Structures are given as structure tokens and as C-alpha cells.
Design a protein around this nucleic acid. Structure first.
Length: 540
DNA sequence: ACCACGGCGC
DNA sequence: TGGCGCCGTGGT
């Protein structure tokens, strides 16, 4: 309110900034302002004014820092009340929402954003008083990570445009083949991408039985859940499912990628966000790396499109079975911990325990059953879905779930304990104290309660895995920077680096030891590491 | 263009 | 298998 001072601000001001568009690598900086002690300093020319700052403190600090890096200015992000809000409650994911909740308003003026940032930070910092685990997470994980993420987003990754052109044509050709077959079975062309038109074809013209309904529009569903069951009702059903698979891959991960190549860098600049998810896992966008298929050979073909700069090599590091390792640590189950201390193939070992047989006598189908259960228990898979993933009777599925918990009773115990903590405290927590609120545990509708139950015992595992990775990223980055290597991508429990040929194997060695020793667990952390000219070739 | 929606990937 | 980023569709 009282007088706006002229640029530049005193050291330690919070920034507010307006971009021409939300993606900083592609945006123009339209306006910059700083606030300290409630007084605002507005920048005459924003790009030059960036030079006057030593740190970006404020809402979306990381995003200003990426744009600053684009311009060759080293402007590290620092304090950011988004990070505080997210630690207090991970349903806090955006500035608008955080302002709506805690005070103030997210507007479109730089000066006001800078003033809001300063007030919110003080406010939220006060609300965190005495929350020592969350404060530890802020100082040791979230704040320093934000600078790592700025480096990753600003550096981007090289794409193999020639390879993607060839992949596009190969997929395009298979799609054309399938739609021709579909039209022949239907007797006319129609828009396969229109669920309304497909509904008419399947259930009115071809007279197939409808099963499920749609959620809100109240029509006959054509979802995979329905088509799955109808695969014998008509040969057209299988063709649609194949068509959908390929068209989703092409529309999402083949066609858009070259347009994301930045004209100034010649690289693709994946956006990373540390306040997006319920669990604390990093999120990515443009493209969303998390949803590149993980089973299909198609998924593998997409990773082949990510390549090293000439003379460099990609290094891919993955925390193997980290979710189950974390579950072993949280549960304290001695039989599960043993598997991982023995360094044995953990699904074979699981099968060995479950079925009461030596490991030599575990056959591949038994291993598959154990693998399915290991992750079904983790994610709270149903006996019904189990019996159809293994293709066995429903009652044999139930028996198999119980068999797992008889062998790993402390896992059963930990799940129930976690739900009890959640029902009593209103939230659950990770190893490090990252917190998720779970109000719908005490709910009437069975459907909703069970979804809440699943979040309640997943979040502690997923979030612990998440913060192990983040902590490792924070620790690795200054070591990589000094070698002239880069951190490029993070997805699931995997990290991808770029280093010159000559330093590649040294960088691999270094990254593996930092990641494996980032924190002591009841079981060791194991990192799978590979080196290659593309991402697919590096993951092995 | 905006939006909600079905559908699908994790 | 298991909140949201993603796509194309269809209503303004």
C-alpha cells in the first residue's frame, strides 16, 4: 500500500513475475516485480532486471529460474511458499488454490504476486512451527530439489527426429490396416475415435450386448472393460482394442514430440513439478513421461527416440523393486526382509515361501503368480481382478491372497495398522514424515471407502520411494555439475543422466553409489545401471 | 476458442 | 491390476 520504491530491490526480496504462457522455456517474461517488507519494486525492463537478483524467492520460483537459465543467467530458486503449502497438505498444488485457502489472491500483476508470495511464506512458515519432520523435508529435499528441477527442465533432451518419422509411418500403416478391417466388418466407414458412433455400431447395428453404463452421460459404455468381455461376441471387438492402443500411442507420444523441440536449443524441455501428486512423487508434463506404456514393446520404441548429444551418452539408473523394499522396511516383516538381504530374485523367493517349495522347484508360472500378488498386495488389487489376471477360479484367487499373508503376516499387520493410524489421525505418513490426509476412510459408500483405504496404505510406500529418489537427486547434482554432466529425466523410480563419452562410466559409478547409499534401510537399495546412445539402449 | 465428457495410461 | 495428464469428440 505505502510507496512503491524504484528498481532494484534490497537483497532478499520475493519475486513476482508474469509470463506470456505457462511454460517458462517457451514464454516471454512480460513483467517482473519484487516485494520486501510489503513495499513493491517494479522492473523497467524485466530481462535486464533478472541480473539484479541473486535468488528467486517466491511463488513458482523454479519457473522463473528455468527462464533465467534459458537466458544464460544463473538464478537459483530459493524459498517458495508452494513448497510449504504442499508439505502442509499435498492437495495444495497450485498458486490460485493456495491463495484461496490461506489468504490473498493470485492475480495477473507481477507486483501483487510478489507481495502475495511474501505474505504467504510468512503465513505458511508460521503454520509449520513445531512440524520438525516437514521442516526437515523442506530444507533437505524440497528447496534444494527445486534447483535440480530447474536445471533439468532448462537443459532438456535431444530427440531422434529421423527415428520418430520412421516410427510414425510404421504405426500409421498398422492403424490404416486395422481401421480398414473394422469398416469391412461394420459394412461402412465411421469415426472410430467417436465413442458415440462406435456405441451405435456395436450395440445397435451389430446388436452386441451392452454391459456397463457410462459414468455421467448415462449411455452404453464402449470402454475396454466392456470390450474385454465381448471379445468372443464379434471379431470386430479385438480390432478396435488394437486400434485404440496404437492411436493413443501415436497421438500422445509420436505426433506431438517433434513440435516440442525448442527452436533456440534444439532439445525437448520436459516440465517437472514437485507439488503435483498425492504421494510426493515428481510429475512431468509436455510430455507426461509417467504414462509412456511400461509393458508394451511400443513403450520401448518411444524411449528409443530419446538420445544423447553426439559425443555424449545417456546413463539410466533405476531403483529395482524399491516399492517392495520399502514395504519390507515399513512392515518389519522378517521373511520379506530376508529375501532382499539374500540378494535373491525376489519373486522366485516369494513363490518359494508361498508355495512351500525350494526355489529350484519354482516354475515360471508360479513366479508369475507371485509377481502378480506382490504388486497386487502393494496396490490393493482385488481377488476378482487377480483371478482374471492369472486366469484362475475366483476362489483359488482368494486362497492365493491369504497364502501370501500367511507367509508375510507382518505385511498384513502393517496394512491394518496404517489404516488405524489413518482412521484416528486423519492422515498417513511416509518414513520421512511426508503427510497425506485421508478423510474418506470413515465413509458410508463402500466404493469410496475402499479407494481411500488404498491411498492410505499406498501413500506411505510410494512417498517413501519418492523421497529416497529426491534425496538422491539433491545429493548427486552438485557432483554431476562439477564433472560437466547433466541430469535430464526422472520418471517412476528411474533417473536419466547425460555425460560425455569419456566420463560416462565414471559418472555411472558415481551415480550408482550415491543412489544406493542415500539412506539406510532394513534391506539394501539396489540400482540397475546402463549406458547407451539412446534411453532404450541405456536401460540394460 | 471454451468446456465436460469417455476412454486410457501409470 | 491401481488422481490426474492426456487425447479427440461434441456442445456452446
Amino acid at each position: 500500500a505505502l510507496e512503491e520504491a524504484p528498481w532494484p530491490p534490497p537483497e532478499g526480496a520475493f519475486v513476482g513475475f508474469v509470463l506470456s504462457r505457462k511454460e517458462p522455456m517457451w514464454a516471454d517474461l512480460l513483467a517482473l516485480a519484487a516485494a520486501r517488507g510489503g513495499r513493491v519494486h517494479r522492473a523497467p525492463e524485466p530481462y535486464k532486471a533478472l541480473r539484479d537478483l541473486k535468488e528467486a524467492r517466491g511463488l513458482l520460483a523454479k519457473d522463473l529460474s528455468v527462464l533465467a537459465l534459458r537466458e544464460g543467467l544463473g538464478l537459483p530458486p530459493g524459498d517458495d511458499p508452494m513448497l510449504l503449502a504442499y508439505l502442509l497438505d499435498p492437495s495444495n498444488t497450485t498458486p490460485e488454490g493456495v491463495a484461496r485457502r490461506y489468504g490473498g489472491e493470485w492475480t495477473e500483476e507481477a507486483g501483487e504476486r510478489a507481495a502475495l508470495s511474501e505474505r504467504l511464506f510468512a503465513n505458511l512458515w508460521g503454520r509449520l512451527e513445531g512440524e520438525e519432520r516437514l521442516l526437515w523435508l523442506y530444507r533437505e529435499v524440497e528447496r534444494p530439489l527445486s534447483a535440480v528441477l530447474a536445471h533439468m527442465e532448462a537443459t532438456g533432451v535431444r530427440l531422434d527426429v529421423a527415428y520418430l518419422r520412421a516410427l510414425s509411418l510404421e504405426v500409421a500403416e498398422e492403424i490404416a490396416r486395422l481401421e480398414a478391417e473394422v469398416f469391412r466388418l461394420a459394412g461402412h466407414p465411421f469415426n472410430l475415435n467417436s465413442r458415440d458412433q462406435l456405441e451405435r455400431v456395436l450395440f445397435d447395428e451389430l446388436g452386441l450386448p451392452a454391459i456397463g453404463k457410462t459414468e455421467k452421460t448415462g449411455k452404453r459404455s464402449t470402454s475396454a472393460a466392456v470390450l474385454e468381455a465381448l471379445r468372443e461376441a464379434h471379431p470386430i471387438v479385438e480390432k478396435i482394442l488394437q486400434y485404440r492402443e496404437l492411436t493413443k500411442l501415436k497421438s500422445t507420444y509420436i505426433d506431438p514430440l517433434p513440435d516440442l523441440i525448442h527452436p533456440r536449443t534444439g532439445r525437448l524441455h520436459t516440465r517437472f513439478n514437485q507439488t503435483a501428486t498425492a504421494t510426493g512423487r515428481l510429475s512431468s508434463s509436455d510430455p507426461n513421461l509417467q504414462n509412456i506404456p511400461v509393458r508394451t514393446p511400443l513403450g520401448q520404441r518411444i524411449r528409443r527416440a530419446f538420445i544423447a548429444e553426439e559425443g555424449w551418452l545417456l546413463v539410466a539408473l533405476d531403483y529395482s523393486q524399491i516399492e517392495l523394499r520399502v514395504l519390507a522396511h515399513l512392515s518389519g516383516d522378517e521373511n520379506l526382509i530376508r529375501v532382499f538381504q539374500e540378494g535373491r530374485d525376489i519373486h522366485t523367493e516369494t513363490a518359494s515361501w508361498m508355495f512351500g517349495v525350494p526355489r529350484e522347484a519354482v516354475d515360471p508360472l508360479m513366479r508369475r503368480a507371485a509377481k502378480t500378488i506382490n504388486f497386487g498386495v502393494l496396490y490393493g488389487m482385488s481377488a476378482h481382478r487377480l483371478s482374471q489376471e492369472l486366469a484362475i477360479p475366483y476362489e483359488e484367487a482368494q486362497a492365493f491372497i491369504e497364502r501370501y499373508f500367511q507367509s508375510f503376516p507382518k505385511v498384513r499387520a502393517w496394512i491394518e495398522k496404517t489404516l488405524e493410524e489413518g482412521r484416528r489421525r486423519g492422515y498417513v505418513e511416509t518414513l520421512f514424515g511426508r503427510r497425506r490426509y485421508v478423510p474418506d476412510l470413515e465413509a458410508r459408500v463402500k466404493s469410496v471407502r475402499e479407494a481411500a483405504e488404498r491411498m492410505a496404505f499406498n501413500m506411505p510406500v510410494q512417498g517413501t520411494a519418492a523421497d529416497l529418489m529426491k534425496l538422491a537427486m539433491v545429493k548427486l547434482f552438485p557432483r554431476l555439475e562439477e564433472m560437466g554432466a547433466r541430469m535430464l529425466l526422472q520418471v517412476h523410480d528411474e533417473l536419466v543422466l547425460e555425460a560425455p563419452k569419456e566420463r560416462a562410466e565414471a559418472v555411472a559409478r558415481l551415480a550408482k553409489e550415491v543412489m544406493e547409499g542415500v539412506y539406510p534401510l532394513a534391506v539394501p537399495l539396489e540400482v540397475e545401471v546402463g549406458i547407451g546412445e539412446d534411453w532404450l539402449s541405456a536401460k540394460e
